Design a binder for these strands. Structure first.
Ligand SMILES: Nc1ncnc2c1ncn2[C@@H]1O[C@H](COP(=O)(O)OP(=O)(O)O)[C@@H](O)[C@H]1O
Ligand SMILES: Nc1ncnc2c1ncn2[C@@H]1O[C@H](COP(=O)(O)OP(=O)(O)O)[C@@H](O)[C@H]1O
Ligand SMILES: Nc1ncnc2c1ncn2[C@@H]1O[C@H](COP(=O)(O)OP(=O)(O)O)[C@@H](O)[C@H]1O
Ligand code: ALF
Ligand code: ALF
Ligand SMILES: [Mg+2]
Ligand SMILES: [Mg+2]
Ligand SMILES: [Mg+2]
Ligand SMILES: [Mg+2]
Ligand SMILES: [Mg+2]
Length: 1937
DNA sequence: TTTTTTTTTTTTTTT
């Protein structure tokens, strides 16, 4: 075992044997740029440092001599071979081994050991693993000759990935397994990081694993540094090793040796060991010890082997490196100086391969051409492989390229492409070949195969074979090869960056330079975009230091600003002077501004060269180092060679390529054609148009079709979107009869059609409506919810690959329409993207951003989309120029409109005010008349058009047709024969295409729709507010569809459809299919299967917002499934549109409104389920409730407005206003009436409505009920109305339906369960089951007699309104019926004892005080899912604080984090609620939206989410008092029904809430009995059936209480009379799933997460003294509740702070700790003391910010260490930002949210003092008001006088809020200054009022004994006798508590 | 024998 150094110690160490074994084989493999070759050379260096001879086989053809030298290699003494064939390569190894003259041979890249046969055969064939069997034969031979020569052989090898293997790692080596075995060492080298000189990248942090070892232990690893231009940091390691082995001292940053300090920092420990090699050896050796006639026989057999190899293989087969002339680093200009500088070697190396990759439009091709220009500027010949089929000749010229002298190939196949490269290299006639897009090097097999055939990485193995071949022919031809490549992302990767190149890793390695070009910004002429600010990174470099970057400008139509750079570089290097704006050279002023420094160096090229060169000298760390008739002889022999192999025009000069020409078509928009620069869309290229839904994508598309068919070209349309209107297409000037149209099933199909249409060359222009609808086969056949991640994309990238070629050689223009989608979570630039991956982006020769920017108005009517289109990609002319115009609906682009404007701006048309003139002659007054005259004179229009074009374009235009229709109808029939009958046909004769429309159930709507209804086979979205009428309208189109014998399906994803109501809307309940799906996936898969059956005519989906993804449901509430919803929608749309159109099944989606937070443009209204829907929808509907329809008192109708916000069917934006009567629906005939009136079809003489003379009814109400009565007349009127106002009029059978219906039924049932889908009429879980509210009039107003089971109910209202109360009362009357209730006291303010006084079973009531809102809801979820709870209630959604918010600080902006939590919760809950028949009540608080000037600024918390899902929304309010004369005993209360899905809404309920009793149920009963004549009222007496029941309502109350028999009897008959929606082994299955859910919740969230109320110990009403007895008395509960929040407010000087301190005193008197937040900055310590406060023990904060203030509260609560915190003045809780507009409030509301929880579980009482600002209010918004369990109105009412001196504030304190006892009781006492509350003072008064103390005038007596004359003396005596005081105190307490 | 290609929003906030 003889070992050589590796040149890396840690490596030698990891090797175990101290190096690489002699006579053995070693493989080093690793990534491109890893350091394979480097390491190699370093073992060579340290072998030549020991007098051993090395040979190098640069099979890679990429060894840098000069570098080799910088690595310590003896260049002059190193043998070097650049062998042609691998065989050669190895035979050399063999002969060098056999000589025994070489000690170490290395082979740079076995991957480049190309077999003979492979090189002399083509690129593409099957010589498969010929490489390997060569390796295995070589190994076989070599090992023997190696050991008996003790010759060490190193193989460098590359990494390759074998497709589709998922065992461990798909990393492999080249040259088969052969090597692997024979190797005695295998080495995994890698670059792991950077070594940085701060800015400069100077080193490859490198790791090398021993993956095979026959020499010592394997797998030991070695980590070190490879400094570029030096090699391995040997001493670097030495250092570390010395450190680890205690040979070098490290005291912090200082490194010592034997006591003597060697350097501070590792960088200085390095440079000292370098300086002292004596010491280094000494350390090196001791480290090693610790961790591990002779030479003239050589040179005689050396030179005999030399000559042997030379004699077999040719002249310079092998030679010394130092004297290799073909080896030299020859560099070409890039056309960018800073680039040449960053390259280090001044350019791109000749004979090597260079890859340039970067984004679409980056400048890849551009840069390419610029190196071509500057190569042709030096008399070198260039070849171009436009595999991309998108090189602009004319542009090439503008870049300085010699078009006439530049070779150009547009190859069909990639193989072809490369074989051309090969033959051009082999000729040595081309100096530089470039390949535009390896990504377009489509393999033969792929082109001939279909789109969708998996040729997985066939591309790659082609590349790896090509590289193999090319590098050799490149170096011996000194031919530089540039590859342009595209960016693609590898899906699912979580490391580093998912950016990659095409054509596999192959390229990466072989490349001697790899270039990351990018567009980083704009270069602006102010308005015009003229330049791509561009950055190019050197990502691979074999030539000099990598990673140096180059930043410059690419001016369009000029190229790289070469001199631009020169300038800057001159500036930075002090070669050019810059004094402000002036640029000087050698004193002489060259230009003011960089723009003038540019144009002067351009003007003086003598000076430029002089500067260029000196710059180069200064910044290049790798400087440059019968003749031409031998070229053109082998040029034209290769030319003809390529021509003879591949066809006529396989290759030719650019200047004379006729298929190349930039031929352009009109867009149908002039300004667009102008912005395009080239006057239109390029033929044979691909164009992408993307933009918003309704933008005009499809429209524009058709308009280029029109103007193409206007020039006799044939167009094909791929309506992948399944939403093209034939009739409309016609109105756009399209030849419907002559336009090919495909509605393909699969995207593959779609594209294969494109392919076959291109290949025929018969179509001139194909357009594809929505790549976003190019659904892959696998996706359609698979389910919705199957992850086919970017299957779409790899389909696109394969399609592009194929199409571009067939497009250019067919001059067929391909337009792709695409949609916008957002990439979630991105914080840079704009989150706008396209579908179908980046693929498209690159291939496109034009990319178009169309948008709707405004309206075009005929005053009232919306008639036009003011439209803007940006050129975002341009390969044709200058990009980014924009085009603004008008799209009139039913006409298209106002072409002439533009013409006009353009004529105006260019002085071709005269404008004198309003008159437009041409050549003097007046053409029209107003633009509208300038329009209609140019329309009338097309001769003049052309004349103007052309001259405009001449003036504003910067790239002007430059047996035949029976060959088309012969290959047309052969392709037609081809497509028809592959894919079916009507796969493709002329538009004009498509019967499935027809715009078939259904009634909406609203005429004015059908009218506004323009086409008389909703289109069949299309998707319609209806969105709008909660209660708007979405579901309603839905059902009404269902009714009028079932009225025409069509079958409807309903997806009640919302879980809130009323069967009974559905019926009242005219829906056939028995015949209506209904699904309440669990998951959205389910929901959609149902849609899919219903569409696919073609058995349903119309499916509707109630709330996409409720299409909860599987993962979301199974996951928790609070798990971020960000837009998982969306990608589900976008997959669903993709699938559905196809199955919808071929089933003519109309799909309606109902969706909800949500706001996007933080947006300052337009309107923050949006839809759920992402943009997906928006596009696919053929109609989008904005429904709204705008007003009331009133029967005087009763609210009976939703005055309703519906906007058409999207329309693919007719003109959009027309609006429809009508009435939705509850329990009847839309008043269809209502409209009919109005419409008849407006159109003079019905007569109106005042109030009388007449028809044809005959009087039909007085009043609209009577015109209604008569048309209802005569449907004959109604139809007759309906139709004539329609004729008059529609600018888009209407245009064995059924046993095939019910056969595929019941097969789909059973299909859905079999996939998803029993009652997944069924007829409405027989759904038992659907039934409207109602619970009592505990308030009759409420149950009455509800219409359905109570709250619906399985639904969600929101009750909102003011603080103290009675929200919680009402809640409990429905709980009581639910537990009174044996139902189980759960309570989520998120508010942390439910009184157990009170709950009891309300009739609630405390012992049987589940109660949760959850920490987080997530928790809160997850509890709801688990309680619903158990089905064990019948009714859950949540006290304050406003207290459902999100985790993040709780853990985050108060003042952290979690903007509407609350909401997205709610919307996720709703999503989840409604389903689990209905299938558990569990009623969920949410209590919520009122908040105001600031700055709103409409209606009412009242809102709810937790976003709109709740609002929609709720089946009932309840506005409770306190309206007045119920008085026992003096005492306030009752909250006179009013509750509005603000949402109702259950019966008629808006009916109101007024009643009484007695405190300590609850709702006076019977109270209502009484009134109701009175109003309904069931109870007699003769004045004050109330009678029943004659018998007198009580005088006064108070006595009518207490008698019904006493006779519950009579009460039920009255109750029921009342109910019968006023409800317009009447009511419709068992319990041991409950308590079994109850206690399993109990334990479930307990096990997830902790011990006392949930428990019975009666046994909650943290719940207890624990009270503290206020320091004022009468106050404690008025409080009712004897003080302030612990764990709750209390607000005390009152006037300045009132005594707020005082009182505060007094509760503190009496808390510290009971050994509790108090904290004070003197936010007011005005607490007197000394005074605090005089009030009995322990100053030394009282915590005090004077916080700067309110946030601070609260965060302190939070942390004090959370510690549970403070018992009572007080905050002096919320009014002084100034928000941070306000030091640095109700910012105050949203801070309060966030604080409350957080605090209440931490307060109750800490039993920490929080007092807030607040100020006053009846117009009396508090600061810090309503937030406080609600959360407070007590609110206190303190006031100073008078003086307490010592005669003269004022000594006391006579003080009054009202209880204005109380959750603890009866409110409103008041407390009057004295606050003596310097003493505080006169405790005994009160005692006195109280004693007086309660007859415990005698008062005979002025004398106060106790038990007869006289205690003092005057209250002042009754005071000072009780002070003196505390025994007596306690005795009185206690008896008072007994009496009044 | 040698990769293949993205995927799609998310939800108010509070005198
Ligand atoms: N024919 C042309 N006329 C004017 N500008 C062009 C032309 N072709 C491309 N450009 C512009 O030059 C820049 C780089 O183009 P290019 O190098 O073709 O992109 P890629 O890197 O995708 O090959 C882009 O901003 C593009 O808009
Ligand atoms: N523990 C209690 N004892 C007596 N009365 C109470 C108690 N809690 C609340 N009240 C009274 O009942 C009415 C409604 O209280 P509540 O429903 O808690 O208000 P909210 O609607 O804010 O939840 C109020 O007038 C209040 O003063
Ligand atoms: N530093 C002080 N020394 C003596 N008396 C004070 C002091 N501060 C306040 N007072 C008196 O105590 C009473 C209540 O003060 P305070 O509670 O601060 O009023 P507010 O209710 O506005 O906070 C007032 O009559 C005031 O004059
Ligand atoms: F074509 Al669209 F929304 F994608 F109308
Ligand atoms: F004394 Al003040 F609010 F007026 F604390
Ligand atoms: Mg190398
Ligand atoms: Mg290009
Ligand atoms: Mg469209
Ligand atoms: Mg609804
Ligand atoms: Mg409450």
């Amino acid at each position: 075992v003889e070992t050589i150094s590796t040149g890396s110690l840690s490596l030698d160490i990891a090797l175990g044997a101290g190096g690489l074994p002699m006579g053995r084989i070693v493989e080093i493999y690793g990534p491109e740029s890893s350091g394979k070759t480097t390491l190699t050379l370093q073992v060579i260096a340290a072998a030549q440092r020991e007098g051993k001879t090395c040979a190098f086989i640069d099979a890679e053809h990429a060894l840098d001599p000069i570098y080799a030298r910088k690595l310590g290699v003896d260049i002059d003494n190193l043998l070097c071979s650049q062998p042609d064939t691998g065989e050669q390569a190895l035979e050399i190894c063999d002969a060098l081994a056999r000589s025994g003259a070489v000690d170490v041979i290395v082979v740079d890249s076995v991957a480049a050991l190309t077999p003979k046969a492979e090189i002399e055969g083509e690129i593409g064939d099957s010589h498969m693993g010929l490489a390997a069997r060569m390796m295995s034969q070589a190994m076989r031979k070599l090992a023997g000759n190696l050991k008996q020569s003790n010759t060490l052989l190193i193989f460098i090898n590359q990494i390759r990935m074998k497709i589709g293997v998922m065992f461990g790692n798909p990393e492999t080596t080249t040259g088969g397994n052969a090597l692997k075995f024979y190797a005695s060492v295998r080495l995994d080298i890698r670059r792991i990081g950077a070594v940085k000189e701060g800015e400069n990248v100077v080193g490859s942090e490198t790791r090398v694993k021993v993956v095979k070892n026959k020499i010592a232990a394997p797998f030991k690893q070695a980590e070190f540094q490879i400094l570029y231009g030096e090699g391995i940091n040997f001493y670097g390691e030495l250092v570390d090793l010395g450190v680890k082995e205690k040979l070098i001292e490290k005291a912090g940053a200082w490194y010592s040796y034997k006591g003597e300090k060697i350097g501070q920092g590792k960088a200085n420990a390095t440079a000292w060991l370098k300086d002292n090699p004596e010491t280094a050896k000494e350390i090196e050796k001791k480290v090693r010890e610790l961790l591990l006639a002779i030479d003239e026989n050589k040179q005689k057999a050396l030179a005999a082997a030399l000559g042997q190899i030379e004699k077999q293989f040719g002249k310079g087969s092998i030679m010394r490196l130092g004297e290799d002339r073909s080896m030299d680093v020859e560099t070409i200009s890039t056309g960018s100086l800073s680039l040449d500088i960053a390259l280090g070697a001044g350019g791109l190396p000749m004979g090597r391969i260079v890859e340039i990759y970067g984004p679409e439009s980056s400048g890849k091709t551009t840069l390419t051409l610029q190196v071509i220009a500057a190569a042709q500027r030096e008399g070198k010949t260039c070849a171009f492989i436009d595999a991309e089929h998108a090189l602009d000749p004319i542009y090439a010229r503008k870049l300085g390229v010699d078009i006439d002298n530049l070779l150009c190939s547009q190859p069909d196949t990639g193989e072809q492409a490369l074989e051309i490269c090969d033959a051009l290299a082999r000729s040595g006639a081309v100096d530089v070949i470039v390949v535009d897009s390896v990504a377009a090097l489509t393999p033969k097999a792929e082109i001939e195969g279909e789109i969708g055939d998996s040729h997985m990485g066939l591309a790659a193995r082609m590349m790896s074979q090509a590289m193999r071949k090319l590098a050799g022919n490149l170096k011996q031809s000194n031919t530089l090869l540039i590859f342009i490549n595209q960016i693609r992302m590898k899906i699912g990767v979580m490391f580093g960056n998912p950016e990659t190149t095409t054509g596999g890793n192959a390229l990466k390695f072989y490349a001697s330079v790899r270039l990351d070009i990018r567009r980083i910004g704009a270069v602006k002429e102010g308005e015009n975009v003229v330049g791509s600010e561009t950055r190019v990174k050197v990502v691979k470099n074999k030539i000099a230091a990598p990673f140096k970057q180059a930043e410059f400008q690419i001016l369009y139509g000029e190229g790289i600003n070469f001199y631009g750079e020169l300038v800057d570089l001159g500036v930075k290097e002090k070669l050019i002077e810059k004094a402000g704006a002036w640029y000087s050279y050698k004193g002489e002023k060259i230009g003011q501004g960089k723009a003038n420094a540019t144009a002067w160096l351009k003007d003086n090229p003598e000076t430029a060269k002089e500067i260029e060169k000196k710059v180069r000298e200064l910044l290049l760390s790798n400087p440059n180092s019968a003749i031409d008739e031998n070229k053109q002889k082998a040029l034209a022999a290769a030319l003809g060679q390529i021509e003879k192999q591949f066809g006529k025009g396989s290759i030719m000069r650019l200047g004379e390529d006729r298929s190349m020409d930039v031929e352009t078509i009109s867009t149908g928009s002039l300004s667009l054609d102008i912005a395009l620069g080239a006057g239109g869309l390029p033929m044979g290229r691909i164009v992408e148009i993307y933009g918003p839904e309704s933008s005009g994508k499809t429209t524009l598309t058709l308009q280029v079709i029109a103007a193409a068919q206007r020039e006799g070209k044939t167009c094909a349309f791929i309506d992948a979107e399944h939403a093209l209107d034939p009739i409309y297409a016609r109105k756009l000037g399209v030849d419907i009869d002559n336009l090919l149209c495909s509605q393909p099933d699969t995207g593959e199909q779609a594209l294969e059609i494109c392919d076959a249409l291109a290949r025929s060359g018969a179509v001139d222009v194909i357009v594809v409506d929505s790549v976003a609808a190019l659904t892959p086969k696998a996706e359609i056949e698979g389910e919705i919810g199957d992850s086919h991640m970017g299957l779409a994309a790899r389909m696109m990238s394969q399609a592009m690959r194929k199409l571009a070629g067939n497009l250019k050689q067919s001059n067929t223009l391909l337009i792709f329409i695409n949609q916008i989608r957002m990439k979630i979570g991105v914080m840079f630039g704009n989150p706008e993207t396209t579908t179908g991956g980046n693929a498209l982006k690159f291939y496109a020769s034009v990319r178009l951003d169309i948008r709707r920017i405004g309206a075009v108005k005929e005053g009232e009517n919306v008639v036009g989309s003011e439209t803007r289109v940006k050129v975002v990609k341009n390969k044709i002319a200058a990009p980014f120029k924009q085009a603004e115009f008008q799209i009139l609906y039913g006409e298209g682009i106002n072409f002439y409109g533009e013409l006009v404007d353009l004529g105006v701006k260019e002085k071709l048309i005269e404008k004198a005010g309003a008159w437009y003139s041409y050549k003097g002659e007046k053409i029209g007054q107003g633009k509208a008349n300038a329009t209609a005259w140019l329309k009338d004179n097309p001769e003049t229009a052309k004349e103007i058009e052309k001259k405009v074009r001449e003036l504003l374009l910067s790239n002007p235009n430059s047996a035949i047709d029976e060959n088309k229709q012969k290959a047309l109808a052969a392709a037609l029939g081809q497509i028809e024969k592959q894919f079916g009958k009507g796969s493709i046909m002329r538009l004009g004769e498509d019967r499935s295409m027809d715009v078939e429309t259904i009634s909406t159930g609203s005429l004015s709507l059908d009218i506004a729709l323009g086409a008389g209804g909703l289109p069949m086979g299309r998707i319609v979205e209806i969105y709008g507010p909660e209660s708007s009428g979405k579901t309603t309208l839905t059902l009404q189109v269902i009714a009028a569809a079932q009225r025409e014998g069509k079958t409807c399906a309903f997806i009640d994803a919302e879980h809130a459809l009323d069967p009974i109501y559905a019926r009242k809307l005219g829906v056939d309940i028995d015949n209506l299919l209904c699904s309440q799906p669990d998951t959205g996936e389910q929901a959609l898969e149902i849609c899919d299967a219903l569409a696919r059956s073609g058995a349903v005519d119309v499916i509707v989906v109630d709330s996409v917002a409720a299409l909860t993804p599987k993962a979301e449901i199974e996951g928790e509430i609070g798990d971020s499934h960000m837009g998982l919803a969306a990608r589900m929608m976008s997959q669903a749309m993709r699938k559905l549109a196809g199955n919808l159109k071929q089933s003519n099944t109309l799909l309606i989606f109902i969706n909800q409104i949500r706001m996007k937070i933080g947006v300052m443009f337009g309107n923050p209204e949006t839809t759920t389920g992402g943009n997906a829907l928006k596009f696919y929808a053929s109609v989008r509907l904005d429904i709204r409730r705008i007003g009331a329809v009133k029967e005087g008192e009763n609210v009976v109708g939703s005055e309703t407005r519906v906007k058409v916000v999207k329309n693919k069917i007719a003109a959009p934006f027309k609006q429809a206003e009508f009435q939705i009567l509850y329990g009847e629906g839309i008043n269809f005939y209502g409209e009919l009436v109005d419409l008849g009136v407006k159109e003079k079809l019905i007569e109106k003489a005042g109030a009388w409505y007449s028809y044809k003379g005959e009087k039909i009814g007085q009043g609209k109400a009577n015109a209604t009920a008569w048309l209802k009565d005569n449907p004959e007349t109604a139809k007759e009127i309906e139709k004539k109305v329609r004729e008059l106002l529609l600018s888009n009029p209407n245009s064995a059978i059924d046993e095939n339906k019910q056969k595929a219906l019941a097969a789909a039924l059973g299909q859905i049932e079999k996939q998803f369960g029993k009652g997944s889908i069924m007829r409405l009429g027989e759904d038992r879980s659907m039934d409207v089951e109602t619970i009592s509210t505990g308030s009759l009039s409420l149950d009455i107003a509800l219409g359905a007699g109570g709250l619906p089971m399985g639904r969600i109910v929101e009750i909102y209202g003011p603080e103290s309104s009675g929200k919680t109360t009402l809640t409990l009362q429905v709980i009581a009357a639910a537990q009174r019926e044996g139902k189980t209730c759960a309570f989520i006291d998120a508010e942390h303010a439910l009184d157990p004892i009170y709950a009891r006084k309300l009739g609630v079973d405390i012992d049987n009531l589940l109660c949760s005080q959850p920490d987080t809102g997530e928790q809160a809801l997850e509890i709801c979820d688990a309680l619903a899912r158990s089905g064990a709870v019948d009714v859950i209630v949540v006290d304050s959604v406003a207290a459902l604080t999100p985790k993040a918010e709780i853990e985050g600080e108060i003042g952290d902006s979690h903007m509407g984090l609350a909401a997205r939590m709610m919307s996720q919760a709703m999503r989840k809950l409604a389903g689990n609620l209905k299938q558990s028949n569990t009623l969920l009540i949410f209590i919520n608080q009122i908040r105001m939206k600031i700055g709103v000037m409409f209606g009412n600024p009242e809102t709810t918390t937790g976003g709109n989410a709740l609002k929609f899902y709720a089946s009932v929304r309840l506005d409770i309010r306190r309206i007045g008092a119920v008085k026992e004369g003096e005492n306030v005993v009752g909250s006179e209360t009013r509750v509005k029904v603000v949402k109702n899905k259950i019966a008629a809404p808006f009916k109101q309920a007024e009643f009484q809430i007695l405190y300590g009793e609850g709702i006076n149920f019977y109270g209502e009963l009484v009134d109701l009995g009175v109003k309904e004549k069931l109870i007699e009222k003769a004045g004050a007496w109330y009678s029943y059936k004659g018998e007198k029941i009580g005088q006064g309502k108070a006595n009518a109350t207490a008698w019904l209480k006493d006779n519950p028999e009579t009460a039920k009897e009255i109750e029921k008959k009342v109910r019968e009379l006023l409800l317009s929606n009447p009511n419709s082994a068992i319990d041991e299955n409950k308590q079994k799933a109850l206690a399993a859910a109990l334990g479930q919740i307990e096990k997830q969230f902790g011990k006392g997460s949930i428990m019975r109320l009666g046994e909650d110990r943290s719940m207890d009403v624990e009270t503290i003294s206020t320091g004022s007895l009468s106050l404690d008395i008025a409080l009712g509960a004897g003080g302030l509740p612990m764990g709750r929040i209390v607000e005390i407010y009152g006037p300045e000087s009132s005594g707020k702070t005082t009182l505060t301190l007094q509760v503190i005193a009496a808390a510290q008197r009971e050994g509790k700790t108090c904290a004070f937040i003197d936010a007011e900055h005005a607490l007197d310590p000394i005074y605090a003391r005089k009030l009995g406060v322990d100053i030394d023990n009282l915590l005090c904060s004077q916080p700067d910010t309110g946030e601070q203030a609260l965060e302190i509260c939070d942390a004090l609560a959370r510690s549970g260490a403070v018992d009572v915190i007080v905050v002096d003045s919320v009014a002084a809780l100034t928000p941070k930002a306000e030091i640095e507009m109700g910012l105050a409030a949203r801070m309060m509301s966030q604080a409350m949210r957080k605090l209440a929880g931490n307060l109750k579980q800490s039993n920490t009482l929080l007092i807030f003092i607040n100020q006053i600002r009846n117009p009396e209010t508090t600061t810090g918004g309503n937030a406080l008001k609600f959360y407070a369990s007590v609110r206190l109105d303190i006031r100073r009412i008078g003086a307490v006088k010592e005669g003269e001196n004022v000594v006391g504030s006579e003080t009054r304190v009202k209880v204005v809020k109380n959750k603890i006892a009866a409110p409103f009781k008041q407390a009057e006492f004295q606050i003596l200054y310097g003493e505080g509350i006169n405790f005994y003072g009160e005692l006195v008064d109280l004693g007086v009022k309660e007859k415990l103390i005698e008062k005979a005038g002025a004398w106060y007596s106790y038990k007869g004994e006289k205690i003092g004359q005057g209250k002042a003396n009754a005071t000072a005596w009780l002070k003196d006798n505390p025994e007596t005081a306690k005795e009185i105190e206690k008896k008072v307490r007994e009496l009044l508590l």
